[PDB]
């Protein structure tokens, strides 16, 4: 993170050991469940590309996902260099240079250069752009490591409707279904995969029924 | 949360890992017991709509309640757009725009826009309004997931009166009974569902008896 | 709690998750032992009526004691309204209004109104008065939930005198005995309920003996 | 504790939940071992008489020692009132009054009065004086609860000399032996209670031998 | 670490017990796994050579690696003295002297001298240079303590392809393979060491296939 | 520790409960292993003689080492009084007096006197000098409590060379061997106490071999 110096400068704030161990423990415990991506977005608030690389390098194991994530960063950095070409002549002494793709990734850039980009006015949010690339690669890792398909999420003859709905939207979240995909799935597959007794209840509920109405109705079955 | 910059600005304060792990652990341990709603109100003091969405997205599992909560937010945001219509012409450069329903929800708004709304004078408390919508949806989830009805809360022939009163008001709290409903329930059902020996004691106590008098009297049975 | 803003205002300070979980854990572990009341007085130092209601609402279970505590707050708020009647005409725009009983309880008052009362000069300590009502109700709950009477605290024929004195004053504290009641109980019941050998030792010690002299003398028996 | 307000006042700083739970846990775990008295002196650095009473009242159990400690405070407060008599006429409006014995104890004094005494120039260190009374009573409790006499600390025929010296000075510390008492005990009883083989080694070491020389010599036996 | 004094000086900030115990616990738990080197780089952000020596000396055990690390520091300090020779005449009173190799190591230098070097303008980053020597020695220790060769990382006939890729890049990271070495290893050895069914799938995928394409294809085998 | 007051004074900063419990737990767990001495040097950064005495007095047990440590402090304080004699006439009102040996030890000096010595210009570092005496006594305690001699550290016929080197330098550290003693021991005893197969490998390696070369060579045996 970046914090303002008491004299006036903008200095880099080290990652607290609390944030470090919290990150390595939620990865050790929950692996690549969907909820660890917003947790990574929370523990990396205001971080620089060097801070982001620090959090990612402290991960033990999961090196297959780390190399996949590194390939996604390289692709996004290449697209950035295509969209933001540099007229790189001789360097200007003491002036802010335009960041390349690898500069946003924090590999070919220094902590001072990253601070100067993020604290500029207008700021070049190299930390937020890099963080957006990491979220993109993490979404691909979570989707790939999704165990079950939505076709195999069917309510058992004695499973409570709320528990089957739990597995339903848990699978939809792992498969990176957007909110509209979840809405259309609520109108169709959720009713069509409920057990016979609940399915007749959900059909008699009528179209346009909300999730509160569907779960309250099938509470008795 | 929002904190004042030492130079003068109003900057966003990141959620501490302590607050994050405290929230995900009380949800993992207590699920949707009534006491986790005031705990959510405590851990989200002064938070922005982006901070609130961060706390809600870090929840693992319970995706049925999350989609229900998302439906309640959509309904309240639609009622807000009906009560506060916008005369949305061309945008004013560098000026504060009127927040829509989805802007209060933190989806179609940015962290800077939320800060500007909350730090304005008079403030547009988008964080408190969004937080009020979340409390409303959480109350519906707790009420739906209430296991027992108040009819099945009856004092056993050897259960202490205080323990039966514990289950009594615990069930009333889960079923979202207001304070007047609990007062009228104390005058009627609490006596009518006590075991025979305690019931005769509570009847001889006379009307208008307080809970201290009722629990002290049936202490011997 | 209330903390001074760096610009000059008096702003509300959110309850730390450390204070929250410390409160819910000492209630989960020790229930209504006498020592949890001073702990509640320590964890609620400088709190507002809204902060106090937050700590009390985060308690899981014990709803019988919570409703008893709520009845005691209502009684004390009614006595306050009798002792401090309001000449409530039309409201004065932008001026501090006189707090009623429910305003001290934090139900009919807002966080801004509570801050203005507590930060006034002279301050209207609505937080300390409300906290004094809560301590009063908590004392009634601890006294009611006291298991043993002082008559059944008698030194066994092989129990060390210090352990019997432990149970003695532990029972006296639960039954809300004041310091003079404990002093007179030390002169009388403590000697009269010691086992025969210690009782003869305590009688030969002479009147006006201190607790250090009584426990050192019966150390051999 | 007392901390300086940013505007200029001297305000009371609440006891952190870390300090509270640390105190109640070292008392729960170690009871009245000698090392808990310096720990109490460390966790109560700069505390007011109200903070000290808060830490002492949060102790669960050990009510026999608490009443003994309360008797010692009363004795020291009575000796203070004898050494510092007050010419208590009518009170001076807005002026600092002379603290009595019970005012130092924090019972007949308020937090504001204690702050004014401690922050005066020259300060009336009511917190340090009260803390000195508490240390005096705690020393009497630790000495009374000392299990073994120094006569029964004798080196076994196969116990390492360092372990017997451990029990030796551990017993001397519990019995409140000063440093000179420990020095004279090192010259005499420590050698006279070592097992025969070590005792002959310690005698041949010569007089005026240090503890390093005594423990290094008997390392082989 | 170094922090600015409120008056104006640059003072040394002590290592927090959180950072200390976090370092000694990740060494106790994970030994010399690759991820503990970036963790050491994170917990030592902004540290002085004295702070670095403190963190390294608090390590219990692993004294073989500690002496190896000490030999690597001596070699790098000797190369520094060769690249930066000093014209060491008489000392200049009150002036900053040129740091030698052992001065960067923090052995022949004091905390004040290290602060003056790091807080100078331009700064002599003795902490970052020393930290770079430590990372170099730690890399040699991790590489030496690597258990398996990449030749013995072969996918079992029933091991999921992602798990074999996990062991593959985990071994490559332990053997200090750079990113290009990992890229060329992905093109060659990763396919040539997959089990027969996956190997035929990876060959039919075509050249230039990414890790996401390789792991998604062999998901069925 | 000492911290600067916001008004301008230099005030004593209380030891945090984190630092206290961290010290008493590393002593409870690791006793007098060599690594607890640098840990004590880290947890006592910037401490006063009163803070140092507080940390040492909170130690439960190990009273044999505590009395040995107290004898070493007395010897060093006597040598200080010999090297720095005082011309102690009448005291100068309001002036800084020269510290004696017991004043550095923190027994015959007050917290205010210690602060004035440490915050003077030039400072009288009574805390660092006392801390240097404590490190000296702790080194004697660790050396005395060293279990094994270096003669009994011999590589087993099936022990990995790195593990035997671990026990080798672990024993050398406990016996307070300096770095040159460890270097000469690496050239001689380390090879002469390796098992026959490794010993022939280390002899064929040639003289002047480094620890990295010795451990990499004997990796196969
Ligand atoms: Cl920087
Ligand atoms: Cl941590
Ligand atoms: Cl999120
Ligand atoms: Cl790395
Ligand atoms: Cl750009
Ligand atoms: Cl940009
Ligand atoms: Cl995706
Ligand atoms: Cl069933
Ligand atoms: Cl599932
Ligand atoms: Cl259907
Ligand atoms: Cl259901
Ligand atoms: Cl159900
Ligand atoms: Cl912002
Ligand atoms: Cl945390
Ligand atoms: Cl609440
Ligand atoms: Cl999400
Ligand atoms: Cl509006
Ligand atoms: Cl509004
Ligand atoms: Cl509801
Ligand atoms: Cl029974
Ligand atoms: Cl129930
Ligand atoms: Cl009835
Ligand atoms: Cl009862
Ligand atoms: Cl009962
Ligand atoms: Cl406010
Ligand atoms: Cl917490
Ligand atoms: Cl109290
Ligand atoms: Cl509530
Ligand atoms: Cl009033
Ligand atoms: Cl008032
Ligand atoms: Cl009472
Ligand atoms: Cl017995
Ligand atoms: Cl009892
Ligand atoms: Cl009698
Ligand atoms: Cl006894
Ligand atoms: Cl006894
Ligand atoms: Cl105050
Ligand atoms: Cl705590
Ligand atoms: Cl002490
Ligand atoms: Cl009390
Ligand atoms: Cl006085
Ligand atoms: Cl005085
Ligand atoms: Cl004593
Ligand atoms: Cl033996
Ligand atoms: Cl003992
Ligand atoms: Cl003798
Ligand atoms: Cl021994
Ligand atoms: Cl021994
Ligand atoms: Cl310094
Ligand atoms: Cl710690
Ligand atoms: Cl890194
Ligand atoms: Cl060391
Ligand atoms: Cl240089
Ligand atoms: Cl340089
Ligand atoms: Cl390497
Ligand atoms: Cl299988
Ligand atoms: Cl492996
Ligand atoms: Cl091939
Ligand atoms: Cl796979
Ligand atoms: Cl698979
Ligand atoms: Cl002071
Ligand atoms: Cl602690
Ligand atoms: Cl060190
Ligand atoms: Cl002591
Ligand atoms: Cl001097
Ligand atoms: Cl000096
Ligand atoms: Cl030594
Ligand atoms: Cl073997
Ligand atoms: Cl060993
Ligand atoms: Cl040889
Ligand atoms: Cl080896
Ligand atoms: Cl090996």
Residue numbers in the entry:
A (entry chain A), B (entry chain A), C (entry chain A), D (entry chain A), E (entry chain A), F (entry chain A): 1 to 221
Question: How did the manuscript describe this experimental structure?
Answer:
During maturation of human immunodeficiency virus type 1 (HIV-1), capsid proteins (CA) assemble into a conical core (or capsid) surrounding the viral genome. The cores comprise ~250 CA hexamers and 12 CA pentamers.
While E45A also crystallizes in space group P6 as P38A and P38A/T216I, surprisingly, we obtained data from crystals with two different unit cell dimensions: a = b = 87.6 Å, c = 56.5 Å (resolution 2.5 Å, labeled E45Aa) and a = b = 92.5 Å, c = 57.8 Å (resolution 2.2 Å, labeled E45Ab). The ~5% difference in the unit cell dimensions between E45Aa and E45Ab is explained by the repositioning of the loop between helices α8 and α9 (~3 Å movement) in E45Aa. As a result, the hexamers in E45Aa arrange more tightly than in WT CA or E45Ab, forming extended interactions at the 2-fold and 3-fold CACTD-CACTD inter-hexamer interfaces that are distant from the location of mutation. Interface area calculations reveal that E45Aa has ~160% (726.2 vs. 453.2 Å2) and ~510% (236.4 vs. 46.3 Å2) more buried surface than WT CA at the 2-fold and 3-fold, respectively. Thus, the enhanced buried surface area and inter-subunit interactions observed in E45Aa may contribute to a “tighter” structure of E45Aa, further stabilized by CANTD-CANTD interactions at the 3-fold inter-hexamer interface, potentially contributing to the hyper-stabilization effect observed for HIV-1 E45A cores. Most importantly, the unique interactions between the α9_hex1 and α9_hex2 helices from neighboring hexamers in the E45Aa structure, directly affect access to the common binding site of PF74, Nup153, and CPSF6.
